[PDB]
């Protein structure tokens, strides 16, 4: 029983050493440096398209590679693929289990995935010889529900389930190759790196980690939030990422220097955050709150510069295009709106 | 007009897609959807196996009775936190609940201080007073009664409930348990709790569920046109 006490003591002094090392490399915050830059005055964005047709809540949305096509998943069991320019639809792929919580789009435009509450990730094919849409593979190796899945390539997919684990799959063989463990709470959000070599996942107890795909371990850990993490996205540079939360606060961490930089919190908001996505040049940090409206939080000034309040219910998914031409938001009223 | 030759053919496809979506939206909206809950040894398996059956993770059971399609989701394999995946069950007609009367003298496994009846009461209080289920009624089932009588004939009820003055008879013990279960309902003017004792005849349980669903439908129709 004494060896456990010794191990706890060594772990505690390692945490103290890590804290002193993180304190030593800090000299001045980011807000003290960026006080000589002219900030943006007002970002007034008006709605352009209103894609309608769903009949239940909307839980996910992903933009295509050409920034023209997008896919949205709803609770009624549909996986509609919209057209951004002409509002037309291209497919109406049904689902087996009408309890979905995520969606994705292949970088080559061939496949489309959709997880759900039945802890099974289904992969669909869109370029078949016939005119329908078939199920290419059904991956099932998780215990808890799946929360988010991103296509690492045309043959490899990563999933983040609720049983405190993350795993990398293989579409051709059907079995998982590497499993990432270490989280104490249910992982419920992740985002791949721009260069597709690493990825981060946000736990459910005030924790965020950084994983590597080739080795399959954790490199660094980030903490500082109060309640939990609810949405993560990378900075376009690849050396930073902004994490959501539930206690009305989103922060911006750094990968090279494992320390917080700045926080975007106001005394008017007391509601959680659902989705976070950066901009084309990393200057606007869009955030979707659950008080029926969004925000256009500035990235380097921590000052609000716009409000996209044209929604009825809580927003659940939003993401900027690849070329930075428009943004799309989806709320629980089954109404997508393309802002520009 | 401005559209090209094959651009007018792409618009006709979207119309058919929307028509097929709207046709299926009015079919899956005329069937009753009801959730199922309970403890591990609360006899949920017995409840789902005794009733009419026509059909890891969530399990759906479909059965029809008197021109009504019921969908019963059995969320029993979800070991994750119940807080995150509970807001997707906001739109539901009723909420079945299964408890065990005889599970009041057996202390939990790997635990020597708390009982199962207290855990059932706590879970029922957490379900009834949630911020999402502030309008949906709750059907409450009493599964085991014969074994409960055989247990209370030998062991008194004072071991589980420290405050009890009635005699050691089932006719008033069941009523006392029911009255203790109804008191854990803060929202007394927005939802009702239907108490039933599970019998060996499954037709009785099916009829009780059908009658509760009919009552809920009548109340919702009265609240629809603002008539009361």
């Amino acid at each position: 029983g004494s060896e456990l006490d010794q191990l706890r003591q060594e772990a505690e002094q390692l945490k103290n050493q890590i804290r002193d090392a993180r304190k030593a490399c800090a000299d001045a915050t980011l807000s003290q440096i960026t006080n000589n830059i002219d900030p943006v005055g007002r970002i007034q964005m008006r709605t352009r398209r209103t894609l309608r047709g769903h009949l239940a809540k909307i839980y996910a949305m992903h933009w295509g590679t050409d920034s023209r096509l997008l896919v949205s998943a709803s609770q009624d069991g549909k996986l509609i693929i919209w057209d951004s320019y002409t509002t037309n639809k291209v497919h109406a792929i049904p689902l087996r289990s009408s309890w979905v919580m995520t969606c994705a789009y292949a970088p080559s435009g061939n496949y489309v995935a959709c997880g759900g509450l039945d802890n099974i990730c289904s992969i669909y094919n869109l370029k078949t010889r016939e005119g329908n849409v078939r199920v290419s593979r059904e991956l099932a190796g998780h215990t808890g529900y799946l929360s988010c899945c991103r296509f690492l390539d045309d043959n490899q997919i990563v999933t983040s389930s609720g049983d405190t684990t993350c795993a990398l799959w293989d579409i051709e063989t059907g079995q998982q190759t590497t499993t990432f463990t270490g989280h104490t709470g249910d992982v419920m959000s992740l985002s791949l790196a721009p260069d597709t070599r690493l990825f981060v996942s946000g736990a459910c107890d005030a924790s965020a980690k950084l994983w590597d795909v080739r080795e399959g371990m954790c490199r660094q850990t980030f903490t500082g939030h109060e309640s939990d993490i609810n949405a993560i996205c990378f900075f376009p540079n690849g050396n930073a990422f902004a994490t959501g939360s539930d206690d009305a606060t989103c922060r911006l961490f750094d990968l090279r220097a494992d320390q917080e930089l700045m926080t975007y919190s106001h005394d008017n908001i007391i509601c959680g955050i659902t989705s976070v996505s950066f901009s084309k040049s990393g200057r606007l940090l869009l955030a979707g709150y659950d008080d029926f409206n969004c925000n256009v939080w500035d990235a380097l000034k921590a000052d609000r510069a716009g409000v996209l309040a044209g929604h009825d219910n809580r927003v659940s998914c939003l993401g900027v295009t690849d070329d930075g031409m428009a943004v799309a938001t989806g709320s629980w009223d089954s109404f997508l709106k393309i802002w520009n | 007009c401005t559209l090209s030759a094959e651009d007018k053919a792409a618009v006709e496809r979207s119309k058919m897609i929307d028509r097929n979506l709207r046709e299926d939206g009015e079919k899956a909206a005329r069937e009753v959807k009801l959730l199922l809950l309970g403890a591990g040894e609360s006899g949920k398996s017995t409840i789902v196996k005794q009733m009419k059956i026509i059909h890891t993770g969530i399990v759906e059971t479909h059965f029809t009775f008197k021109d009504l399609h019921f969908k019963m989701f059995d969320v029993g394999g979800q070991r994750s936190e119940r807080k995150k995946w509970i807001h997707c069950f906001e739109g539901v007609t009723a909420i079945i609940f299964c408890v065990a009367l005889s599970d009041y003298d057996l202390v939990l496994a790997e635990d020597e201080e708390m009982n199962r009846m207290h855990e059932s009461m706590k879970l029922f209080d957490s379900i009834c007073n949630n911020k999402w289920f502030t309008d949906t009624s709750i059907i409450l089932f009493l599964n085991k009664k014969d074994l409960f009588e055989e247990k209370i004939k030998k062991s008194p009820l004072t071991i589980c409930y420290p405050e009890y003055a009635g005699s050691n008879t089932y006719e008033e013990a069941a009523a006392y348990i029911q009255c203790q279960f109804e008191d854990l309902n803060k929202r007394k003017d927005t939802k009702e709790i239907y108490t039933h004792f599970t019998c060996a005849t499954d037709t009785k349980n099916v009829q009780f569920v059908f009658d509760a669903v009919t009552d809920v439908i009548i109340k919702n129709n009265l609240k629809d046109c603002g008539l009361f």
């Epitope: 023209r68 096509l69 057209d83 037309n88 291209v90 010889r129 016939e130 005119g131 329908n132 | 401005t2 090209s4 030759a5 094959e6 651009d7 053919a9 792409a10 006709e12 496809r13 058919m16």
Partner: single-chain antibody
Framework: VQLVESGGGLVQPGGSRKLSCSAS????????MHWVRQAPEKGLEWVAY????????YYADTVKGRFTISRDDPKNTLFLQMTSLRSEDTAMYYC??????????????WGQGTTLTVSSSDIVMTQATSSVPVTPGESVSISCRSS???????????LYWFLQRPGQSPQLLIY???NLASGVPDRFSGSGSGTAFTLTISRLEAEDVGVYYC?????????FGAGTKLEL
């Protein structure tokens, strides 16, 4: 995928038979179907068209109101019936499927075709030549000229191209402007400006010989070219 046709033979003017095709191997209820005539030793021309669900039906300007056409989804069969018959319809008939959405390839699978013998404003697409001699292992340039700028306000042209093999039905090569079809090698390529269109081939083998055709799909009265033949 498979497309077979039947119902052809020798008839007399005044009466006619009904042509039927059977489709099996895909979702026939979501595919638009065409009918392309093919005169013997001449050019092929469009005849009719049916959208998905019999919504829109377009006919040729020569046989408008004379032929009746209809689909059958539960049995997967497409019928064509002629009311009045003349001495010109003696030709080969091909029924070709086509689905229209963003990124699709119209009339990719043609079929086999059936024969028929009878005992007795619009865009004009012209070809540059009729038959040229060529040696294996040489780049060839085929040009097809139009009478109107096919470039639409969307930004993409609507000039389709395919190769007619000797003895069987043709197969698509590039559909919209230059996008290569599926299954054909990367040796074929095309380009243009909007009025004068051209097609180039990198390597010429002994397996790709026949008659080349260029199609105009900017307006629903479709029309083809005279057809240039490749001589080995």
């Amino acid at each position: 995928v498979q497309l077979v046709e039947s119902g052809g033979g020798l008839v007399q003017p005044g009466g006619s038979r009904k042509l039927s095709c059977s489709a099996s191997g895909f979702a026939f209820s979501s595919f638009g179907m065409h009918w392309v005539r093919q005169a013997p030793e001449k050019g092929l021309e469009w005849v009719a068209y049916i959208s998905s669900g019999s919504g829109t039906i377009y006919y040729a300007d020569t046989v408008k109101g004379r032929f009746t056409i209809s689909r059958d989804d539960p049995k997967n069969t497409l019928f064509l019936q002629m009311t009045s018959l003349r001495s010109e319809d003696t030709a080969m008939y091909y029924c070709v499927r086509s689905i229209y959405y963003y990124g699709s390839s119209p009339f990719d699978f043609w079929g086999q075709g059936t024969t028929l013998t009878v005992s007795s404003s619009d865009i004009v697409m012209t070809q540059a030549t009729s038959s040229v001699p060529v040696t294996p292992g040489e780049s060839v340039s085929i040009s097809c000229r139009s009478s109107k700028s096919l470039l639409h306000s969307n930004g993409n042209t609507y000039l389709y191209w395919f190769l007619q093999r000797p003895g069987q039905s043709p197969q698509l090569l590039i559909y919209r402007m230059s996008n290569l079809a599926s299954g054909v090698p990367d040796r074929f390529s095309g380009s243009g400006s909007g009025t004068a269109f051209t097609l180039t081939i990198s390597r010429l083998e002994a397996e790709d010989v026949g008659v080349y055709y260029c199609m105009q799909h900017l307006e629903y009265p479709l029309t083809f070219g005279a057809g240039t033949k490749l001589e080995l």
